[PDB]
Amino acid sequence: SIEKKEEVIAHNEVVFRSLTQGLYVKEVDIYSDVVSYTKDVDEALAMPNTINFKNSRKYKKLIMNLDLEPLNKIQKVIYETHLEGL
Amino acid sequence: SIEKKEEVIAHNEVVFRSLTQGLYVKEVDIYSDVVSYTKDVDEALAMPNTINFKNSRLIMNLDLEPLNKIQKVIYETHLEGL
Amino acid sequence: SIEKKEEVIAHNEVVFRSLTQGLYVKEVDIYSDVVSYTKDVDEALAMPNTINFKNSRLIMNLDLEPLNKIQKVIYETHLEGL
Amino acid sequence: SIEKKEEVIAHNEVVFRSLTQGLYVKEVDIYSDVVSYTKDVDEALAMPNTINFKNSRKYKKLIMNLDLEPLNKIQKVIYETHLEGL
Amino acid sequence: AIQSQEKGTNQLDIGILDTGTAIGTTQLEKRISYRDRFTVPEVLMPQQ
Amino acid sequence: AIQSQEKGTNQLDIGILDTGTAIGTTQLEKRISYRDRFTVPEVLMPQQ
Amino acid sequence: KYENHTVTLKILMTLRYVVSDILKESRYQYTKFNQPKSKFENLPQKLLLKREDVIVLQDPYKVNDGIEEDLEIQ
Amino acid sequence: AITSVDSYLLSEIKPRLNTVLENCYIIDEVLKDFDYQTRESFKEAFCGKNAQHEVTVGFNFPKFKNNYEAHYLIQLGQGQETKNSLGSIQSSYFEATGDTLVESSTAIREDDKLVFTVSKPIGELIKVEDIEFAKYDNLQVEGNKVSFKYQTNEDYENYNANIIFTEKKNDSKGLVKGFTVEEQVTVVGLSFNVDVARCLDAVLKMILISMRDSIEEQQTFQLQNLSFGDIAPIIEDGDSMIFGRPTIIKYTSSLDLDYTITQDINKLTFKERKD
Amino acid sequence: MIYFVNKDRIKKGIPLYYDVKEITYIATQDGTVYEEDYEIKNNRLYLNE
Amino acid sequence: PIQDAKPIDDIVDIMTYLKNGKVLRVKQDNQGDILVRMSPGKHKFTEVSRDLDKESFYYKRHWVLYNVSVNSLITFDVYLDEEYSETTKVKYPKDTIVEYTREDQEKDVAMIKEILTDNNGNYFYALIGETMLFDENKLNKVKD
């Protein structure tokens, strides 16, 4: 008995994964080649992906690397109001 | 898909509602008899939904339609692929 | 040619390295198990290279390829003629 | 097993030696003729010879003196990283 | 059309700065707006 | 071409100082730059 | 070769301007002679232009035309 | 934790100002001393859910045109260092801690304990509303959730509590180095109608009063002082003047940085000597 | 001119600082806007959800 | 053959596809590539985009009005945006000045007529006025 429902987006950012190694990028060099890795989603080279930050330039070389798999990490909070009768 | 999820109950209360007009109670008098009504579902007068309070004072009017209101707030994340 | 020279060892440490990936360790967990790797040779996790420490805790993982890292810094001068 | 190597120049300056006496100049008069001498390299009439200070004018008379032998005193610090296995 | 073109230089603690007035006159039926931008490929300006 | 040549003198606590405005007009196709330098051998100036 | 050297340049750049004020902004004529009916025409604006030094943007990306310049016709 | 007073001011002002202007009762309470005319005109213009006219707030030097019917204008102002501690030491922490959070959380039943769930882990529990746990209840925090003995408290299985707690960031330990800064921030209301400016200033004063119960400035921005300027014509070159009364707000905050420590002692080497 | 939209302004209608005769060009973060999505009444602007 | 290019010949087909609303890719000379589009809704007018990459959650194209000239369309090469191939990894592009030697050991210039490859990746080239195929080494890239 969902009386009302609402959704909120807290974060929306891109995170990259190596196809074979299964790790997530955390650091890059001056040439923008990967230097480090982590197996933790909470610590990754996050690229903002909100409305204002689309069409970036910082990570063009990183994107074109075929070994990397971009992922849209999105965090949400949803409020649900229940009326359960008496 | 879902990578991580957790559910918590922010509030759990009892809302009072009129049987004829259908409007919920907003403000009350000294004895807590109704003096104002409102169409809102959340702003309506409410009390904690636990047995101790119920035993500690339904009591105001014969319009006997209380409404157990429970609020579910959920935190979740997704990893949607390309 | 050389007019004066002296050599000193600024640091002497043991670096940990993975056997498969080849990347050195950067960050670790509570037990000092690996959580991050890095391609850098200097930034890698390292510990003093002395027997007392070794007896005082290899211990974290079976990727048993530590690397004794020694840093030589040398001061010298020349008197080059015309 | 030199993993990596680097070099740094701390000082680069000119110092003059008398061909016969074997001493190093320390002081000159108003006419820029030698007044004093030392047998210590650390105390000499140093002329800066970094990139910016080339083609000087203070010591033209001193340079043309045939009795003097210019020397390029250069000081260096070199860092060597060794990987010695286990 | 363009007139009175000035390369006014102000030397300050922050550094040198190029700013000056140039007066222009348009064609008919054209309604320019504040902070519109123009560029003249033909004319080149020396800087150091 | 040169015009309006002025030897403006300011007497101050630091001393006397010579500074003044002179307005010049060049030939065609010449693109002068800020703090360029000119010298006129023909014209001599008295100083004391 | 120039890791720790200084470098200096004498450079040529395109002239650019921005409109910092609009001045004698509108001038008008009811042109009627040799017209079917009265017509309103906006005469030239005067602009007070300002140079772009503090912030510089590249030349705009104009759409090119495939017509060769100085093209022979017969 | 570097402090940005302007952003905090904006975040506190916007929802609170909207809520205050939402209802008429609070506005009538605020404008008790004012005359009938100006009070009712302001209420008609801005007050109420269905108000057609609306106020705005923003920082100074906006490149766009800004509405001058009623607006709150902020500018950063001066700052000064007033007090210091020995070695610039402010506090010592064993576990990295972020902001202080307040969350509502209904009680839950677990096989041995009543518990409350929270959004994020716990570094330290400050207070649970209307509760003073005894030894018998054996209050324990285990990451996200806090817990107490089930049996003797079983009457409260659904207690509608709320929690004031602190986030947990890392298990590392370090030192807090910093000082106290005494900062001044200027706030001014703008309106071509002077009476609207007066009412706007009164509303500003009331929301500043209300803010003193806020968690953040209770913990971060103590010692609030106020100062009001004279009603002056902000601009005369327009068709009509802009009238505004600047106000200066003062705060005291602790600019600080966390200096981590990697030294951890776990063994002892007590040995004698011989000669 | 520029305005910022919220859940409240969408229904009331944006109050414009200037008057209106006609609109030349509209835009937002998602690009331009077409006549099918916006309307103007009594010198205030409405937008869809 | 290679499926990396499918240029449109007639402008009429281009206009027909524009009526259907499909995006186009229009090359330029010593200049960035362009995408062209017909605006939706009540009012119909051309729109252009300086961006080229595919739309995604992390990348969105920007469209603005422009008075596109039919001369550009008729003259410059045009492709369907969805079916365009970024690059064919060959030393010499199509329609490029090249030099070679004829069957009688006589040197001659020409432009590339066709770009071909075998199943093993070896690339063969056909020049104008030459039916036979030429090796990559046998060709020479003429300097402008």
Sign, CA torsion H117/H118/H119/H120: negative
H246: its two tokens: 């600047």
Tell me the residue ranges of DSSP E strands in chain E: 2-3, 9-12, 15-18, 21-25, 37-47
- Provide the CA H113 distance to its chain's centre, in angstroms: 34
* Closest residue on chain C to D15 (Cα): C79
G14: its two tokens: 């395109």
CB contact under 8 Å between E48 and F31, yes or no, is no
Query: Is residue J99 helix, strand or coil?
Result: strand
> Residue H23 corresponds to which amino acid?
N
CA–CA min distance C53, chain A (Å): 27
The shortest CB-CB distance from C67 to any of D41, D71, D85 is to D85
Contact of H197 with H191, CB cutoff 8 Å: yes
Residues in J closer than 8 angstroms to B82, CB to CB, are 56-57
J133: its two tokens: 């195929």
Q: What is the dihedral of CA H111, H116, H122, H125, to 10 degrees?
A: -110
Contact of H148 with H231, CB cutoff 8 Å: no
* Closest residue on chain B to J57 (Cα): B82
3-state helix, strand, coil in chain D (%, to 5): 5, 50, 40
Q: CB within 8 A of D64, min separation 6: which ones? A: none
Contact of A24 with A37, CB cutoff 8 Å: yes
Would you tell me how many other CB atoms lie within 10 Å of the CB of residue A16?
22
Residues in F closer than 8 angstroms to E48, CB to CB, are 33-34
H162-170, strands of its sheet edge to edge: H96-104, H162-170, H124-128
CA–CA min distance A12, chain B (Å): 10
3-state helix, strand, coil in chain H (%, to 5): 25, 40, 35
Query: Is residue J105 helix, strand or coil?
Result: coil
Q: CB within 8 A of I2, min separation 6: which ones? A: H64
Query: Is residue H88 helix, strand or coil?
Result: helix
Q: State how far the Cα of G64 lies from the Cα of G72, in Å rounded to an integer.
A: 20
Q: State how far the Cα of F9 lies from the Cα of F23, in Å rounded to an integer.
A: 18
Measured between alpha carbons, how far apart are the two ends of chain G, in Å? Answer: 56
With 0-12 / 13-18 / 19 or more C-beta atoms within 10 angstroms meaning exposed / middle / buried, residue G40 is: exposed
A62 part of contact set with chain B, CB < 8 Å: no
Q: What is the dihedral of CA J18, J23, J29, J31, to 10 degrees?
A: 140
Query: Is residue F9 helix, strand or coil?
Result: strand
Chains A and E touch (3+ CB pairs under 8 A): no
- Provide the CA H172 distance to its chain's centre, in angstroms: 27
The shortest CB-CB distance from J75 to any of G61, G63, G66 is to G66
H196: its two tokens: 């609207």
Structural biology method used: cryo-EM
Chains that touch B (3 or more CB pairs under 8 A): A, H, J
Q: CB within 8 A of H80, min separation 6: which ones? A: H181, H182, H183
Contact of D71 with C81, CB cutoff 8 Å: yes
Q: CB within 8 A of H173, min separation 6: which ones? A: H93, H94, H95, H260, H261
Query: Is residue E42 helix, strand or coil?
Result: strand
Chains I and J touch (3+ CB pairs under 8 A): yes
